[PDB]
Design a protein around this ligand. Structure first.
Ligand SMILES: CC(C)CCC[C@@H](C)[C@H]1CC[C@H]2[C@@H]3CC=C4C[C@@H](OC(=O)CCC(=O)O)CC[C@]4(C)[C@H]3CC[C@]12C
Ligand SMILES: *[C@@H]1O[C@H](CO)[C@@H](O[C@@H]2O[C@H](CO)[C@@H](O)[C@H](O)[C@H]2NC(C)=O)[C@H](O)[C@H]1NC(C)=O
Ligand SMILES: CC(C)CCC[C@@H](C)[C@H]1CC[C@H]2[C@@H]3CC=C4C[C@@H](O)CC[C@]4(C)[C@H]3CC[C@]12C
Ligand SMILES: *[C@@H]1O[C@H](CO)[C@@H](O)[C@H](O)[C@H]1NC(C)=O
Ligand SMILES: *[C@@H]1O[C@H](CO)[C@@H](O)[C@H](O)[C@H]1NC(C)=O
Length: 624
């Protein structure tokens, strides 16, 4: 039958629940699962010092510092520094136990728990791959993969070579197909709707997933996917996300490829590892008992092992489209980067920030430099992060001779490069403003992306644009006002008005000249620019200027005209690889000695400050 070979499960198998559980729980060779678990454990062991930030844990979770934090849950406070150098060692032990196999369930739990404790602790450190590693660890906890090529096999008589159910491979393949197919779909929806190499990746996503499943296509599919994933390294700073998929692909091959690979390619010894004759029947595998009397009755380890696949794959498919349920996290474009399998927005051009505060006792105004406390910049363009920042400042300022201060932000984003628009309302007090994950926020100003004839003049002017100038479009809301002191280098500055009316004011001659729909006004340099909007509709400006003195100074340069990358490129790959190995050894050893110091502390007594300083200096010491 065509269904018999293509789509290996027979069509009549999908007839009842009791047939489905039998279909999912059927014996299969565990050879591939062992290799995948080994490589995943190896990679998770390797990346912990570098990417998860064990080398730079002292500089981030210091003691005696005052820093605002951005946790997913506001009650999930971090542990002290010397009780946080230990959870990473617990995580490392769990990952090593994953890799080898010793106490596989315990090692899986010991790696799972701290990873999801330190992942839901900084919303500014969520990537697309960290979520994937967490999901893979969560899957591998429940699926037994020590049945072949494991140390735990040599200390037991039931895991040397056994039969795993099929739903392990089913869940792994389904999860990776979802990863390959959801990203491709999101690449389509985003690109041509909000509006080469772009189409190549999209077609690769969808075609690679689909063809990699269906039988004859594996060789070409493996070639193409492997080429793409190997080339994506040294082109994106994604980390080890490429290597996880380069090792997640040979799980779409027949589940016996290691056994067929060892056979040929002759050798002198193939008997040190257990000789591959045949697996052994397992306990958790529904077998075809004699139909004369009755069939096997599956237990809880089969029915639950079948229902978990469905209840997990459906939820995984539903989650990346759960945007409409979490609305408070939704800024203009990207709400809670992470569980989306799509790329972020590159912070547009955030520019000017004007945090100001008023004291609740003396009623005095004060200015704060942007980002005085925090360690990240992502708190700026987010409604869920700005509230946390304001609340942290409200908590901490009363220790600086203030009391219940009221804070106002003025964030002038640039959506692409020429649409300066107030993303956050100046007039609202962020500390006492209501906020909820589901209910829509009230102080985020609605987008005015086009909302104007700004996409016509945009071109109608470039034909008439002279030499070295600059034109900026600014959209303003009703009931607010603006200010921008102009320098002493921009000449012929002028404003053209598109929607509504403006009340341009100069503080020097004290002029309050209003404008109607269409009026050219020449404004001087080095003066105030108090522009007010009185119309109920948002306005639009045509701020145009030319550096008239730039032509004068560039003529002087033209008058005179009439009057270690190379070293690193010439050098071959040997010394570059040597430098890579040296820096990796340095970071690994720094992590190891710092962890050893923190482990000695709070286990024994803490020694004197002199020894602490000496050993800290010793750890910093760069080798050669
Ligand atoms: C005499 C006193 C000062 C002892 C100090 C010795 C340190 C310099 C040693 C102790 C622990 C060593 C580390 C122990 C374990 C590893 C794991 C090892 O991991 C691998 O990546 C090797 C396997 C692979 O290539 O995948 C790399 C070397 C490293 C960082 C070692 C580097 C050198 C360290 C820090
Ligand atoms: C120029 O005219 C504008 C009116 O558009 C004045 O703006 C007003 O300023 C007062 C100050 O207390 C506010 O109460 C009003 O609400 C503002 N009106 C608007 C429409 O925003 C501005 O003060 C004038 N300039 C000077 C120097 O007096
Ligand atoms: C040590 C403390 C913080 C306990 C941490 C354990 C809890 C918070 C962690 C452990 C494993 C985690 C789960 C791992 C995988 C998934 C699947 C994903 O699609 C939704 C979130 C969800 C369901 C996680 C929710 C949080 C979770 C349950
Ligand atoms: C104030 O903040 C700015 C931007 O975050 C920073 O560059 C500057 O160093 C801060 N001021 C001081 C005194 O550090
Ligand atoms: C200023 O320069 C612009 C350049 O496009 C020109 O159109 C305008 O006439 C100039 N104005 C004055 C007053 O020189």
């Amino acid at each position: 039958s065509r269904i018999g070979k293509l789509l290996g499960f027979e069509w009549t198998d999908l007839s009842s629940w009791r047939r489905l559980v039998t279909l999912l729980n059927r014996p299969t060779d565990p050879a591939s699962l062992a290799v995948f678990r080994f490589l995943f454990g190896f990679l998770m062991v390797l990346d912990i010092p570098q990417e998860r930030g064990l080398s730079s844990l002292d500089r981030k979770y210091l003691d005696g510092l005052d820093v605002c934090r951005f946790p997913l849950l506001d009650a999930l406070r971090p542990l002290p520094l010397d009780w946080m150098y230990l959870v990473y060692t617990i995580m490392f032990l769990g990952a090593l136990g994953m890799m080898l196999g010793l106490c596989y369930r315990i090692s899986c739990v010991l790696f799972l728990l701290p990873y999801w404790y330190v992942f839901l602790l900084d919303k500014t450190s969520w990537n697309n791959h960290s979520y994937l590693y967490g999901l893979l660890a969560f899957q591998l906890t429940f699926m037994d993969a020590n049945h072949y090529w494991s140390v735990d096999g040599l200390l037991n008589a039931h895991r040397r070579n056994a039969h795993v159910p099929l739903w392990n491979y089913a869940v792994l393949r389904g999860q990776i197909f979802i990863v390959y197919f959801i990203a491709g779909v999101k690449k389509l929806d985003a690109d041509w709707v909000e509006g080469v190499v772009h189409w190549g990746g999209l077609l690769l996503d969808l075609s690679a997933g689909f063809l990699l499943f269906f039988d004859v296509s594996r060789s070409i599919g493996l070639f193409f996917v492997s080429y793409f994933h190997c080339m994506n390294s040294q082109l994106f700073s994604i980390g080890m996300f490429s290597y996880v998929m380069l090792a997640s692909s040979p799980l779409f091959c027949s589940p016996e490829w290691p056994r067929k690979l060892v056979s040929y390619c002759p050798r002198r010894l193939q008997q040190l590892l257990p000789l591959k004759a045949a697996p052994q029947p397992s306990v958790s595998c529904v077998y075809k008992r004699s139909r004369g009397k009755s069939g096997q009755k599956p237990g809880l380890r089969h029915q639950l092992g079948a229902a978990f696949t469905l209840l997990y794959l459906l939820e995984q498919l539903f989650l990346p489209y759960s945007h409409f349920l979490t609305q408070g996290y939704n800024n203009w474009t990207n709400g809670l980067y992470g569980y989306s399998w799509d790329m972020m927005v590159h912070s547009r051009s955030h520019q000017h920030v004007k945090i100001t505060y008023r004291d609740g006792r003396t009623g005095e105004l004060g200015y704060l430099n942007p980002g005085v406390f925090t360690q990240s910049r992502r708190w700026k363009d987010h409604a869920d992060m700005l509230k946390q920042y304001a609340t942290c400042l409200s908590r901490l300022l009363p220790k600086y001779n203030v009391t219940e201060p009221q804070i106002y932000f003025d964030i002038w984003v640039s959506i692409n490069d020429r649409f300066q628009q107030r993303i956050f309302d100046p007039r609202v007090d962020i500390v006492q403003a209501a906020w909820s994950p589901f209910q829509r926020t009230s102080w985020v100003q609605p987008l005015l992306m086009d909302l104007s004839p700004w996409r016509a003049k945009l071109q109608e002017i470039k034909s008439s644009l002279d030499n070295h100038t600059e034109v900026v479009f600014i959209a303003d809301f009703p009931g607010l006002h603006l200010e921008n002191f102009v320098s002493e280098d921009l000449g012929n500055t002028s404003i053209q008005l598109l929607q509504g009316e403006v009340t341009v004011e100069l503080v020097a001659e004290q002029k309050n000249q209003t404008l109607r729909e269409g009026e050219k006004m020449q404004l001087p340099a080095g003066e105030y620019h108090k522009v007010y909007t009185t119309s109920p509709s948002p306005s639009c400006y045509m701020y145009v200027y030319v550096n008239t003195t730039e032509l004068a100074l560039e003529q002087d340069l033209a008058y005179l005209q009439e009057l270690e990358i190379e070293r690193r490129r010439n050098t071959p790959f040997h010394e570059r690889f040597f430098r890579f190995l040296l820096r990796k050894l340095y970071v690994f050893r720094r992590s190891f000695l710092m962890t050893c110091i923190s482990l000695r502390n709070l286990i024994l007594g803490r020694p004197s400050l002199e020894q602490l300083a000496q050993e800290v200096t010793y750890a910093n010491l760069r080798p050669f």
